[PDB]
Structures are given as C-alpha cells and as structure tokens.
Scaffold this active site. Structure first.
Site, short mmCIF file in Angstrom:
data_model
loop_
_atom_site.label_atom_id
_atom_site.label_comp_id
_atom_site.label_asym_id
_atom_site.label_seq_id
_atom_site.Cartn_x
_atom_site.Cartn_y
_atom_site.Cartn_z
N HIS A 170 0.81 -1.23 0.00
CA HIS A 170 0.00 0.00 0.00
C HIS A 170 0.83 1.27 0.00
O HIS A 170 0.30 2.37 0.17
CB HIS A 170 -1.01 0.03 1.16
CG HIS A 170 -0.38 0.12 2.52
ND1 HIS A 170 -0.23 -0.98 3.35
CD2 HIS A 170 0.09 1.18 3.22
CE1 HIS A 170 0.33 -0.60 4.49
NE2 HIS A 170 0.53 0.70 4.44
N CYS B 13 4.91 1.87 9.02
CA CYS B 13 4.70 0.71 8.16
C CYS B 13 5.99 0.34 7.46
O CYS B 13 6.79 1.22 7.13
CB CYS B 13 3.61 0.96 7.11
SG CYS B 13 1.98 1.02 7.82
N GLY C 79 3.73 6.32 9.44
CA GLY C 79 5.05 6.18 8.87
C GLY C 79 5.85 5.02 9.39
O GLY C 79 7.00 4.84 8.95
C1 LIG Z 1 1.23 2.62 7.73
O1 LIG Z 1 0.67 2.67 6.42
C2 LIG Z 1 2.43 3.57 7.90
O2 LIG Z 1 3.15 3.36 8.81
N1 LIG Z 1 2.77 4.71 7.02
C3 LIG Z 1 2.05 5.22 5.86
C4 LIG Z 1 1.80 6.68 6.28
C5 LIG Z 1 0.51 7.04 7.05
C6 LIG Z 1 0.28 8.29 7.44
C7 LIG Z 1 1.33 9.38 7.12
C8 LIG Z 1 2.45 9.07 6.47
C9 LIG Z 1 2.72 7.62 6.03
C10 LIG Z 1 0.17 2.84 8.82
C11 LIG Z 1 0.58 2.44 10.27
C12 LIG Z 1 -0.57 2.79 11.30
C13 LIG Z 1 -0.82 4.28 11.24
C14 LIG Z 1 -0.78 4.79 12.74
N2 LIG Z 1 -0.39 3.57 13.58
C15 LIG Z 1 -0.26 2.39 12.72
O3 LIG Z 1 0.03 1.29 13.11
N3 LIG Z 1 -0.85 1.95 8.36
C16 LIG Z 1 -2.13 2.53 7.94
O4 LIG Z 1 -2.31 3.69 8.05
C17 LIG Z 1 -3.20 1.59 7.43
C18 LIG Z 1 -3.11 1.40 5.91
C19 LIG Z 1 -4.08 0.24 5.53
C20 LIG Z 1 -3.53 -1.20 5.66
C21 LIG Z 1 -3.71 -0.56 4.27
N4 LIG Z 1 -4.47 2.14 7.84
C22 LIG Z 1 -5.26 3.05 7.00
C23 LIG Z 1 -6.51 3.56 7.52
C24 LIG Z 1 -6.99 3.17 8.83
C25 LIG Z 1 -6.21 2.29 9.62
N5 LIG Z 1 -6.56 1.80 10.96
C26 LIG Z 1 -7.58 2.41 11.80
O5 LIG Z 1 -8.41 3.11 11.31
O6 LIG Z 1 -7.54 2.12 13.18
C27 LIG Z 1 -8.75 2.04 13.93
C28 LIG Z 1 -8.34 1.65 15.37
C29 LIG Z 1 -9.77 1.02 13.37
C30 LIG Z 1 -9.39 3.43 14.04
C31 LIG Z 1 -4.92 1.77 9.11
O7 LIG Z 1 -4.19 0.91 9.93
#
Ligand SMILES: *[C@](O)(C(=O)NCc1ccccc1)[C@H](C[C@@H]1CCNC1=O)NC(=O)[C@H](CC1CC1)n1cccc(NC(=O)OC(C)(C)C)c1=O
Ligand SMILES: *[C@](O)(C(=O)NCc1ccccc1)[C@H](C[C@@H]1CCNC1=O)NC(=O)[C@H](CC1CC1)n1cccc(NC(=O)OC(C)(C)C)c1=O
Ligand SMILES: [Cl-]
Lengths: 305, 305
Positions: B41, B145, B143
């Site tokens: 992603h 991920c 960030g």
């Molecule tokens: C991951 O993509 C990442 O680390 N970096 C990409 C990025 C995001 C924001 C700004 C710059 C770069 C993140 C890691 C997450 C974010 C915060 N803590 C983590 O463990 N993964 C996501 O954001 C993930 C992408 C999805 C798998 C394809 N994502 C997107 C939207 C929602 C959620 N989760 C969420 O809504 O949590 C609940 C508790 C349900 C509210 C999500 O993990």
C-alpha cells in the site's frame, strides 16, 4: 498508537564491544577510536577481590598482559592507564566503526538503554532508569561487566554507564565512562547496601500523559490540586517531591493534551490513595516511573535516528 | 540477577532498513541482497484506501516511480512485482550489510523484537508476542509501516513480521515476509475486528519460573493440581488451555528450579483465584505472558549473538 518500553537501537554500540582478558578474568570493553575502556577490576584475581590495591596491581602489568579481542581478531595493546575505576587501553588500531560519541553523567530519574554483553558480544537491549539511590534495575550475569548504557541523539551516542556490580536487593551499580561510580559505591568485594529509593513522580506524571495520548483516560477526574496538597500525599507514598521545575518540564505534554499539570496531579493523588481497583493503564497494573517526559514525547511523536 | 523485558540486539536489522516513497506516501522497506520488501500500500493515495485494486494500481507504475533510499544514498530500481501484500523492488545493488537471514512464520504465543522505523531510520527496539487473535501490542505511528519483527539465532536473522495497520483496541496487524497477513485482516481501510484474545498460560508459567530463579518465591504454596482441574480454572479466567506439550516444554525450567510443573500450576491457580494481595513478581503487579520458556532460559543463561 500504543506505548511500549522502547530501547534505542543498539547497532552503533554493538560495533564498539570487545572482550578484555587479564589472566583468568574476562569481561567487556568499549573500543572507541584507539582506546578501549573497561572496568579496572579486570586486573584482579578472585582472591584479591576483598581489598584490592588497584594501582599496585597495575604497576605489575604490561601491555601484553591485556588481551583485547574484537570478534575473532586480536588487537595489540600499546599503552594503558587508569582513570578512577576504568582501565584505558590504547590499542594500535582505531575502531573503524566508532560512532560520534560523548561521555556524559546522567542525573537520577533519567533513562538510558543497556546493551548486555558477554565475551564482547551482545545479548540483549533494554531500558532502565538511574534511580535516586544511584542504582539501576537491570539484568546482568557473570561476565556482563563492561556492558554500557547510552542514549542516542540524532547520530551521537551519549555513553553514560558501564556495569560493575550487583547489590543485595537484585539491583545494579556502575560508573560513568570516566570511571566514577554513581552513588556511594566502590569496586571492592565488601558488603554494600543500595539505600532507600523513591518513585520518580515526574516520570509517573509523564506516563499518565502518555496514557491520555493513547486514549486510556478512566483515571481523569474533574478536580485540581496544589503542589503542597499533592506533595503531602506523595510523601506518604515515598514519591519524590514535585517541584515547579518538574511542572515546567511537563509543560509540552500538558499542552498537547490540554490537561493542566496540577489537574493531572489531582488524578495521580486519587490513584495513589484509592489504588487501581484491579484496573490497568497502558497494560500495567502499577504506576510506571521509568518513562521520562522526553521519552514520552519521543515515542508519541516519532523521532528517528 | 534481575529480569527485564529484553529485545535482541538490533544491529543486523538496522543495516537493512531503507526508505520507500511512491508519490506522497513514504514508508519503510527491508533491503536484503538486491531486493527491497515493503507493504504494497505504498502505492495507494489517501483517497483509494477504502477499496484499493492493487493490481490496477501497480500496473500504472514503473520502476522509476519507486523512490528507494538507503540512508542518504538513492538506490536504482530495475524491477518490481507483487507477492500477496508485500511489494518486492529489485535494485541493481546488493546490500553489503545483508545478514544471514530466513523468512519464518511465527505461531501465536511466540515472541520477537520489533525495530520500529520512520523514513527508513531505526527509532527504537522492543519485544512483543503474537496474540492468539493474531495481533500484537506494539507502538507504531504514522510512517512506521514496513517495520519488521525478528528473532536471532546465533548469527541468523529470522524475519517474522512486517507492520501494516492498527486495529480498534490500539493493537496492530501485519504480514509475514511473503506478504500473508497473520489473522483475519486485509490491507484495506474497512471495519475489521481483532477478535477475542487469551492469556498465554505457558508463558505465565515460564515467567513464574524466572521469578523463582531470580529470588521471588512468595507465590509458591503447599498445593499441587492436575492439568484437568487447572484447565477448569484457566478457562474461567480466559487463559489458554494448558496441554501436555506445554508441560513438556516447561521441563527444563522445571528441572533448573526443582519445582514440578504441576506444582507451579497450583501456584498460578491460587494467584488467579486470590490475586496478588498488593505484592509483585519481578516488579510487575500483573501476570506477564510475553516471555516464552525459551526467552526465560536465554536471558537467565547469558546467550549471546
Ligand atoms: C502505515 O501505512 C504507515 O506506517 N505509514 C504510511 C503513512 C501514514 C500516514 C502518514 C504518512 C505515512 C500505517 C501504520 C498505522 C498508522 C498509525 N499507527 C499504525 O500502526 N498503516 C495505515 O495507516 C493503514 C493502511 C491500511 C492497511 C492498508 N491504515 C489506514 C486507515 C486506517 C487504519 N486503521 C484504523 O483506522 O484504526 C482504527 C483503530 C480502526 C481506528 C490503518 O491501519
Ligand atoms: C562483573 O565483574 C562481570 O560481569 N564479569 C567478571 C566475571 C565474573 C565471573 C566469571 C566471569 C567474569 C561482575 C558482574 C556481577 C556478577 C553477577 N551480576 C553482576 O552484575 N561484577 C562483580 O562480580 C563485582 C566485582 C566488584 C566491583 C569490583 N562483585 C564482586 C563481589 C560481590 C558483588 N556483589 C554481590 O555479592 O552481590 C550480592 C547480591 C550482594 C550477593 C559484585 O557485584
Ligand atoms: Cl535512479
């Protein structure tokens, strides 16, 4: 989100660990530039541990009596000198992996990472805190002496601790990298007792703020308190008195959540007086005091190295 | 002496972390030999996160759309492909710091260290365990991920986890290094629930053994139990059934202490029914289940890497 006891990455430090042998004693040393640092009691036998005259033992040693081993390679010792409780071995090779580094002396309540080593190789990494009685709660076995504690700021490693000894209550004592013990300890085999310790109140408060940042907020109430009324309760529970400097240090965390420090003190006061009623905060059944306010901000904002 | 939550030294893994960017999305990648692995992603915009058609998104990219950066040097992408939920970016340069490594799939109840990274540089290292609901309780921000979980055996790095997402209770979900999610999770921005989790009984018992090894004994009592009567109790408290394989696995710890496993089970049983009465075990007021029996032996014996 989430909040874990998080250690600094240990790579920059692993590249500095060597093995120092002197006769039948082996422990760890720190190889920086062309100097190896290690505890001076590498020159002792098990016999003369009761009352060692370190200066006298050292004058009987030569450069070739100190075996220094980086991994599998023998380093060549070309000089030695003693600084308080550390030995300094000048070797003929500068460590190509030497990072940017400082030797610093931390204050009680500060944290650092420990890379526990045996025979110059790393075993594990963990956080702990310098306590007000000048001990730390580490995990150290035979051969762990010379393992170091450190912080990393950008790329600079601040070495603050070198392990020397275990004390009766299962806690640990050491020196800075200038060989000066933290606390009233000496590197002899005599009966030494840690001394009485207090809970680091400013760290407990920081950790409650971390809890709020992560959505754990059951412990907040609508009350406030004063520094005086709080310290009355804190003293009963062997918590370090909270000063205005502590309130100021908590400022950044206070603004990020919008909970005034004295409001959070009122929540801590109630937690201390009513217990936790079988509940938890950030997955812990007791109040954590080994996260500095800087630790919280670092982990809750995403600073890298 | 002492017993801490200890992570593996992270040096071998630090040399593998890089920064992968695609448009306005930046996350972490794992650089081993001439391949960079990262979550697929990285190719999504914030828009197409609800239901991304990754194949459609991927075919629209070329190698020069993947900005990969190892520290401060830019790498050159000469091929790309998708394998389940991980992206594999072939580069023209073999990583000179590549460790010996394997890809393994961990089972629920095993532990590993997490090297949390942001913008391709390591931030901190901590232990956690794969929960029976296929989540972990980590500390991950925007960030993070592409951060990986790992174990080390002697000199070999076993990569078991790559971070992808946060779930409702502030817990985390990811894949192995072939891109297969642990548990019923997908890399979409949709309503997903972790599932109900259990306490890892064999790990609690292992940690009780560590306590005895480290001088904590007050919880040993005059009772014994059977597996059947114990599992009656554990089920009420949402503990995982203890099996004969679990008993056998705790064997070495049983011999080292001279406490039969069924006797230790009787101590856990009374702890479960009556609590801890304001006492602690290894500085913890709750029952710790994130030390495997191997973690305990390893930490208490001083194994190095
Ligand atoms: C991951 O993509 C990442 O680390 N970096 C990409 C990025 C995001 C924001 C700004 C710059 C770069 C993140 C890691 C997450 C974010 C915060 N803590 C983590 O463990 N993964 C996501 O954001 C993930 C992408 C999805 C798998 C394809 N994502 C997107 C939207 C929602 C959620 N989760 C969420 O809504 O949590 C609940 C508790 C349900 C509210 C999500 O993990
Ligand atoms: C340290 O010297 C070391 O790590 N390696 C040298 C070594 C010893 C044995 C075999 C191979 C190599 C040890 C580290 C200690 C041992 C276990 N946990 C530790 O932190 N430090 C000492 O042995 C220390 C040396 C003194 C400072 C000069 N030492 C000597 C005698 C007594 C104690 N403390 C003690 O007896 O502990 C209690 C709890 C009081 C029983 C001590 O730390
Ligand atoms: Cl290029």
């Amino acid at each position: 989100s989430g909040f874990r006891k998080m250690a600094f990455p240990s790579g920059k430090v692993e590249g500095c660990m060597v093995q120092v042998t002197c006769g039948t004693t082996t422990l760890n040393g720190l190889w920086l530039d062309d100097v190896v640092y290690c505890p001076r009691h590498v020159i002792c036998t098990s016999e003369d541990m009761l009352n060692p005259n370190y200066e006298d033992l050292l004058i009987r040693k030569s450069n070739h009596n100190f075996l220094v081993q980086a991994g599998n390679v023998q380093l060549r010792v070309i000089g030695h000198s003693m600084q308080n409780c550390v030995l300094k071995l000048k070797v003929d090779t500068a460590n190509p992996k030497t990072p940017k580094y400082k030797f610093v002396r931390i204050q009680p309540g500060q944290t650092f990472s420990v890379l526990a080593c045996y025979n110059g190789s790393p075993s594990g990494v963990y956080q702990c805190a310098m306590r007000h009685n000048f001990t730390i709660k580490g995990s150290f076995l035979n051969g762990s002496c010379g393992s170091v504690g450190f912080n990393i700021d950008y790329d600079c490693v601040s070495f603050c601790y070198m392990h020397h000894m275990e004390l009766p209550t299962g806690v640990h004592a050491g020196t800075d990298l200038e060989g000066n013990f933290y606390g009233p300890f000496v590197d002899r085999q005599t009966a030494q007792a840690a001394g009485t310790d207090t809970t680091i109140t400013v760290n407990v408060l920081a950790w409650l703020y971390a809890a709020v940042i992560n959505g754990d907020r059951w412990f907040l109430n609508r009350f406030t308190t004063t520094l005086n009324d709080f310290n009355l309760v804190a003293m009963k529970y062997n918590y370090e008195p909270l000063t205005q400097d502590h309130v100021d240090i908590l400022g950044p965390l206070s603004a990020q959540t919008g909970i005034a420090v004295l409001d959070m003190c009122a929540s801590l006061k109630e937690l201390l007086q009513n217990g936790m009623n079988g509940r938890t905060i950030l997955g812990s059944a007791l109040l954590e005091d080994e996260f500095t306010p800087f630790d919280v901000v670092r982990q809750c904002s995403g600073v890298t190295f």
